[PDB]
Symmetry: D3
Subunit: 298 residues, 6 copies
């Protein structure tokens, strides 16, 4: 009665999740015709079934967004009982506030409901208030505990968590609480606010895109006395020259999760990727079986 | 082209067909609204309108052609941006409506994408739509906001009329396009014939000038096979025409190597600069759409057009 | 738990369907007061029940449409679990496109959802895109296979399927595919496009209303060499002089289905009526039990 | 009657009450919008507006009287047609609101048809409504679009005042109409009395001129029984009045054979040409509705009226 | 699987109802911060549960309305299966018609649905057409039978039911039918229409607010020949000087129900309070178990 | 103040902040719309607009401050009243947005009240909103109707600039307010420092004039503790400021007894007349909001402001 489908964004994450929960991915067909149009065909009856769709809205966001919406349409029209969306990475999440700009994080939310979505399971939205962009139920999972565990196990002396900017202090502090460490912040107006002399710095962000911000912060820490610099994020967008910039940086090791598929192309030298696979598989089971999802936060 | 005199009419162009959009604006007499549609390295689209449009009637010109998904998204984001900046109205001029084909795959559990698009456009905040030659006229019923549907057949007809042709027969490429072939046949007082690919011909095409008409020419497999079977059955000559030149895949090579004397299309879809069609004529829908926007904005009768 | 109700359009079809699935029709009351107003009263508790309403929106369409909407309102307000509409004939289906006309096929759809409908089961809509007029689930049944079977069993030599016009070629061809026959079409601008000399013609349409189109086509076929003319449609609207025109025509036999009740009044001489009763009863069971409805098309 | 001077005000009439609709248009000073509401042989209604109304404020005059289902449908289809032809506004003037009776059948699992209608009208696309003497004033709450509710009592009162009557008592036909009898009693500074059919009389009606008032007179069973019991209890005389003359079934014969001296009604519902009431007076709501449409269109105070 | 919560309006009624149906009230938290804002926190997982909320929208109506809406929001966002609202007293019910006034009874209804309500159970709405203000299911319970039983048991000779005004005649008559008594009405334009000489009068209304209307009617009855005056209503709003006015009136006994909590403050001397507790507990069970609720009216 | 000359602009005040509302109206040049918001003995709110506003653009000024529930309700009822009286637009000017705090209680199963409010306002019938210093800028995303968000920081900055201060450091009271401290630091070309209460200080505050900035000062526990720890760590002096003076509970006594040299706030929330702050300065948002309403009404650029 529970059917899980995967689309093109992150097929491997979807498979890992399916193996853990114990189902074969649903029979669907995702064709792209020669003129660029996409067509999904549900290759099996899903009438009366609770359907889960696993899709990160990563590069190319607009293709991933449309195939997800078109698939929801096909399931709604094929009489699915529920259409539950599992989103490891929420694209356009940085477009969450307005000078004559759209609020794309909100537009997508409205689009998703319009298409027929029942509920959403999300992981580390750029802003916690993005939950409020929905009127359908949404269960928000956090990735900070996963990154925090890995660092807690590295036997690092003298650490200070560093927020790459003014908007990342809250996140920095959740990590500094978990690790019992002080916080410093970069104030590119690029000044270092806080004590980092001799300390092992851990730069943290939710998303690492072009990596300009992170590598620059890293270089600044090192020439201001930091013993060493580590860097982590939940979502590895890593577009453009991101990878190169990181390989040449002073960043000892970069730690990311697998919410976004890694560039087949470019390789990161000092890197560690943690899986959110178990977290999502478990959240899917509890949502479907109506157990407590919040048991997952404490 | 500044000459319009209603500073309250704004026209924006997205990336699908900037040339057509420029032509329309020029004809109307106004400069393209100022905005920037950029794509960050991660493929996300960013839009920021560069002049206040608060209280203005805005017109967005976008064909949802290859790649349809990107063009739909920038269109939706553009509308969200104008809605939030307090535009008075957000009018959508769609020269080509992507996903309008409902039969593409002959399957069971399919989506009805042309309907999903309509719902999405309305949700984004569209006030109305101006469309041209929708694949099926009942797509108008997919909207609950006003939609004005323009016909491209008169333009094509007027062109063929000017060629002074003898013994013509309008040919429908398949079963679904007989109504459309009939409209051209009426404009040209010519009989019709249809290709029954199951590849037979219903009608007398012998020693006549055949004109193949379809709404869309995509891979060109259908139209070229229909042109060849036409000639080899005695048609003296074959012209082909359509409103929307999708021309994907091998379309061009197929056309260049076929017996089609001349292919006639409109500029509702931007042509591939890459490859050239040899025997080709392109008619413009710029004046037709420009006239439509003016009558809609000023509240004049547009049915008069079409 | 499954309750089936019938309204005034086609009580006999409703009864046949109820007998096949194995239920007594629900206890409802359809009163028309002296001033013309209608009042439905559900004569039994249907709280928590999945309710099916059988109604063709045939002559008078506006009365049939309103009693259906008022009944949906009473069931919604009486806490029905689901309100499933079974529509053998969809009136106003020819009003599916716009010069300053409404798109009544779309208006009705919106009205139906507004009133509280859960889903729809339809049979041979004038246009397949009318399915897209709904946002609630709709399962579209075809009648061509039923008419096609009957002709396949008549031992007719030399046949050609004839589309009475430009808009009926697709339908004609589905019948010509099933019967392995060529197609011809009438081009009233009234010319016959295609070879019909000595052939047995079968004129096909979805709806036969005043029958002017069909009888004229039939007369034209016969004076252009056709050995004989048969005629069929799924929906027998047959209004005005329809019947007389058919009785005097050259039409050997007219074949229709029972999606619309036959005029108690006027009688057709050479005629055959096939029942969609089994098709709908079966579609109702599969929808309710969540089996595959598409198994019914192949 | 061309004299209005705001070519932007359009008024349409459907089939329920063309005479009333003509009177209103005449008074306003405009010609009835051009359209054709035809019914094909199969009973389907076809509408096609014969002049552009794009950008115009349209007023539709339709009472949903016998047969209510047909009149509702043509009204809904008319609105869909105007919405899709780009009307600026679609204003509904309903002289008589069908299905406004909620108690007709005393059952359990009933529909609330007056609410369903409101939802349907809004869904079709109505901008606002102008109504007259709704059976229950809270039906105004059934709408989420603006609704202006006009009262017919002043017109009736003004008529009775002009008769110079002595010793009058306003009689409520039943328990639900006491508030309405009270309003007339206020206009005429007269006391009230009520018929408690369980058929007793609460109040002193002895040797007085009784005036029975109701909102609707349908089969006339209630009003005639109430008039007879009135006379036989000593009332010197009995007048009867209402806003809406539904007059279905035996209504007329019952009235003609009753003791009602004179029945007074308005023209909110078209009268049966077939049968004649003998002692009868019909007051017009044409001027009242015409004045309402003008103030709504020009944005003037209409509460001033009512 | 059935969880019942109570908010601040009438905690005792909620408890009585919970005891009868056989559940402990749900674990929720209703905090009012120092600046006046309210925060509800569901202290237990209610995922997949049918939740009932017991709240009268009595003084202060706006606080009671908001805490109810905020609670519905928290349950909707915490994935409740259904959110069923039980409303013993419906505030703003007198704002049911429009000169440039709002129709607050309708606004609240729209607000309730917007917040996420599934259905409503109501008791004696000011106007029966207020049921039509909703599009979600609503089951309307009557209190007249409860007041009527109590009077039927008092051995009162010569009774006449009295409507305090023009709008209360229908209600008066339902009570006069149950008791086989004649009706009289007060016509404050303050005249007494009907025979009350020597009779025992029972003044009836739905709501007794400031009690000016009722006490004045009572005084008028007594100086016009009435042997004695009784007074009843379903909803005891009793605000301002209500209580004092009643204690000094000629009203022999005032009978009310417990749909609204009684002023802790002021005491009524000759009074009787009947409980709607059993009625609501029973309606809750039948709604939840899908039995017939209308069995409760006859 | 009658001088505006667009009889079509109406401005109403509810009970949250009548003084601010009066100031705005005065500046604009119009008299407060006429209405009565009364509360019957039972606490129900009654509203009845005393002049026709049919066709007028109406502006409602209401802060949803203590008690937020009453103020929200009168606001919602006011909108229902204007919608039903046929106002053309219903524009909401919210100087202070109650329930904008999402972290107040650190629990699991919570409501998102700021979102519920937005949905309710839209449902009531709001056309648009004008807000000032929302607690989180993404609350703008909670609305699907246009919302113009004004910033109070420039006003505060301009005041501090006029004091001619030396060696200043802008201090963020907590982790969530670093972006806001940064904006003031930009206006004053000053570095920033943050209080890491887990109560340590990140940044050099030694011998400097510290300026604490927050959006809201409620019980004042956070700001006063942050001011004290500042001084005892060597800050030469401490100023404190915020846009919204909620000042609930012991706020005032705490401030009066702290080391804050001067507390600066705006008049977005009505101050308690009861208790006085000793070292205090109140800047007005009346001119800022008045300018915003005019540009919105006349369709001028308001981003120019903020």
């Amino acid at each position: 009665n529970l059917k899980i489908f995967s689309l093109n964004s992150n097929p491997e994450l979807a498979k890992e999740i399916a193996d853990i929960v114990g189902v074969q991915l649903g029979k669907c067909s995702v064709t792209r015709f020669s003129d660029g149009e996409v067509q999904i065909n549900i290759e099996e009856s899903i009438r009366g079934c609770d359907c889960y769709i696993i899709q990160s809205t990563s590069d190319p966001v607009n293709e991933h967004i449309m195939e997800l919406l078109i698939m929801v349409d096909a399931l709604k029209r094929a009489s699915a009982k529920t259409i539950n969306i599992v989103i490891p990475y929420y694209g356009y999440a940085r477009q969450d506030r307005k000078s004559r700009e759209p609020i794309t994080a909100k537009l997508f939310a409205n689009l998703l409901e319009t298409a027929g979505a029942t509920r959403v399971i999300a992981l580390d939205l750029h802003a916690p208030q993005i939950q409020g962009f929905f009127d359908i139920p949404i269960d928000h999972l956090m990735g900070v505990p996963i990154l925090g565990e890995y660092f807690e196990g590295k036997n690092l002396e003298d650490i200070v968590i560093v927020s790459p900017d003014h908007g990342g202090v809250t996140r920095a502090r959740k990590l500094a609480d978990r690790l019992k460490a002080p916080i410093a912040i970069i104030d590119k107006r690029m000044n270092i606010v806080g004590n980092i002399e001799g300390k092992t710095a851990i730069l943290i962000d939710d998303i690492i895109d072009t990596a300009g911000t992170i590598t620059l912060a890293a270089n600044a820490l090192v020439e201001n006395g930091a013993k060493e610099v580590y860097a982590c994020c939940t979502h590895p967008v890593l577009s453009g020259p991101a990878v190169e910039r990181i390989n040449n940086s002073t960043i000892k090791e970069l730690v990311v999760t697998n919410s976004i598929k890694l560039p087949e192309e470019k390789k990161i030298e000092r890197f560690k990727q943690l899986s959110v696979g178990p977290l999502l598989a478990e959240a899917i089971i509890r949502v479907h079986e109506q157990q407590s999802v919040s048991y997952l936060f404490s």
